[PDB]
Each structure stands twice: as structure tokens, then as C-alpha cells.
Amino acid sequence: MDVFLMIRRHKTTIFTDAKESSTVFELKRIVEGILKRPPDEQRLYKDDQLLDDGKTLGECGFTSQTARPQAPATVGLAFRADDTFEALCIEPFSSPPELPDVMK
């Protein structure tokens, strides 16, 4: 079925969905339509394991039970500066405040 993802690089987060049968390269083509960088200038990561173009999203470990609309799975994205690839960097989101007394 469908997989729901967050494609993350620095302070940019793209919310997209793809088929579990679709490939890592088809996902780089979705990033190309939004960020205007071709698939050859992109590296995609599940946590810290680099992903192969011909591998399906299902084969990468992204499934309908782990990549849900309300809890999408994160995909790390790194770009190519000149001829070298930058190190994977995902800036975290802010932290919530301390839980109030009445909520505890």
C-alpha cells in the first residue's frame, strides 16, 4: 500500500507519500520536482544507512505499519556540492516545554 514520509535535509522537511513498491530513485524524482536538484545530486538515508536507487521503499524497510499519515517515517537527504557529497545533516525540531502540574 502507500508509505507516508518526511524527507529531511538541514531545516527543510518535505511531506510526501509513495507506493511501498516504488523505488528510491522514484523518490529522488519527487525531490527533483520540489527542490530542483537531479537524482544524481542526491543521497537518501533511512537513519544512517545509504539507500540504493533500484531498491523499493518496501525493501528499504518503509511499510504501511511503520510509515503512516499521522506518524510518517523520516528519510535523510544529502546533496552534492560541486563533485563531493555533503555529510548527512538533519536539524532537529524544537523541544516542547515542561509538562504543567495540572497535566501530570
Add this chain to the structure above:
Amino acid sequence: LSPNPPKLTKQMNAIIDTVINYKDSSGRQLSEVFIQLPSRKELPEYYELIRKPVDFKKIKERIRNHKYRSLGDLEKDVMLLCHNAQTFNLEGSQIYEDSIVLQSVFKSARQKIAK
């Protein structure tokens, strides 16, 4: 209030126990729906059409408190219960057909006591 001879009460409970426990070939206990009348708050139209309502809980209650003075008085109330079932509900309904069978079970159970 005047207590009945134990032999008459023994007979009255044996007859009504046969009627209440009676099961069909499929194992279904036919007296189930007849044990308790629905309350007048939840089904007032039953009390509008049925002049003297009675259920099996009331009949057991009338044997225990010596209200019935003979087997004929017990039969009068069981035939009233079945007559009321046939008045309120339509011919062909399961409840209407269950009341006729329990009526026949009462009569065979009473004839067994008569020897």
C-alpha cells in the same frame, strides 16, 4: 396466608419446574422470554391491552406464598399467561407458538401428577 399441604406445593413446583426447564429439540428453553414481564415504564402498551398481566416469576411467587389453593388455580394462571401471550402477539410469531407448546407441556406435566 393459611399454609397449603406440602404435597400440593411439591406438585405445583414440579409442574412449573417442568414448564420452565422444558427445552425443544434444538436445546432452546421456551420459557425464557416468559420469566419476567417487561416493565410498564419500558413497554406501557402491553399493560394497556392486557387487563391481568402475569409472568412465570409471579407464578413461582404465588406457589411459594400459598396464593393457589388447588392445581386448578395454578392451571388458571398458566392458561392466563399463555392466553395473554396469544392476545398481545400475533399468530405465527415465535413467542405465540412457544406459549402454545408450554401450555401443552403444563397439561402433560399436570396429567403426570394426576396418574
Add this chain to the structure above:
Amino acid sequence: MMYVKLISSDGHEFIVKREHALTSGTIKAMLTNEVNFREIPSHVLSKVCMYFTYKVRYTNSSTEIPEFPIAPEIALELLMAANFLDC
């Protein structure tokens, strides 16, 4: 295939389908394909974007509806954001 950019108070950029972002009546009013939120932090804005996906995917569908989860620590700010965003 049309996308919009939602910016959090801390400068995070969330790129979401224009259809999904229109779930919010406030965003729909403000739309242009970019809106900056001066008082919504990234941890709340990412959760709001998860809701847009959830609503669109499950609104008028029979493929069993799951619960939308909200951790106790984000609930209050998410309630404030939902009220301001009209979704």
C-alpha cells in the same frame, strides 16, 4: 502536485501539498504558496502537517480510521495551533 511552504517560528520549512494545507481555514484564507508562522514552533508545525495528511487520507474512506495520536507534552501547544489554524 502543487506544494506550499509553511515556515515555523524557529525557521523550519515544511513543504506540503497545497490540497493538504487547505485543510486549515486560516491557511486557505492566507492563500501565493508561502506562509510564515511567527508563533508556531517546528515541533507543533510538523504535527499539524501530520494531521493534514491524516485528514486528507482518511476523510471519506472505508480503509479503517486509526486514532490521531497526541503526546501529553505537545497537547497544549497543538490545541493553541489547531484553534488559530481553524482545522
Add this chain to the structure above:
Amino acid sequence: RPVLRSVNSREPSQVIFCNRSPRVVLPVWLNFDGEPQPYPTLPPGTGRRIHSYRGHLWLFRDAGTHDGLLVNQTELFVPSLNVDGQPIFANITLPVYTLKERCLQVVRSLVKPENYRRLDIVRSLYEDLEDHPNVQKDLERLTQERIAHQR
């Protein structure tokens, strides 16, 4: 006298109440005077065969909070005729709540109603937290929707 009420029919109706929601479901039957009567609850993800009657009216809620639930994609369920040994299905599901209503649900579950006023939020949200899901208010709205629909 109230428009939302059960029809006093005598034809029985075997229905399967199937709880396909993550909530513990409280089935609610509207009696002949349209008064809501609570029935035994349904655990999440289970189906039970029950005895009802044609034209009887039901709605379903979260047994703990009274949050409204959907039955066959709508708010009210009416059992129909059993077409040759076929039980009717009342498919109880979770609605897609608004982000605001879902947030109000989560804050209500975490905070006692006496402490709602101590939360650092805007004045209007305190009133929203205190406007708890209520079967009667929902019946008042559904009665108004029917009055409008038929005009």
C-alpha cells in the same frame, strides 16, 4: 412528541454491532419517548450479535468520554428487515475528528475539569474544554438538522 425516537414495532431484528474503532463503545438506544438508554459496552475490534427491532434508533459513543462515533458512515442507525437469515451490520468506526476536537479530547483526558482554568491558554479554549461531548446536545442538533433537511 420528540422526532428522534424508536418506532414501536414488534418485528424482531438481529443486528451485528461491530466495533471497528480503537474505543470502548457505548451503544445508545433512543426509547419510544426519544430518551437515550445506555446498553452494554463493546470492546475495540469485536462484533456481537444483538436482538433489536425494525425502526429502532441507535447511536454509539466512547463509553468513557461520550465522544461521538460513526455507524455505517453516519450518526444514527436503524435496523432494517432480515432478508432470509441475514443479520444487519452496524459498522461502528472512529470519525476523522478536527485537530481542535482531537486536542480538546486529549487535554480533557489529562486535566481534571476543576483545573481547566489554570492552563495557560486563551479564554475561549476554557469554554471549549468545558463543552464536553453530550448525547442530548447532539440529539438537539440532529433534530434541528432534520427540521432543516425537510425544507
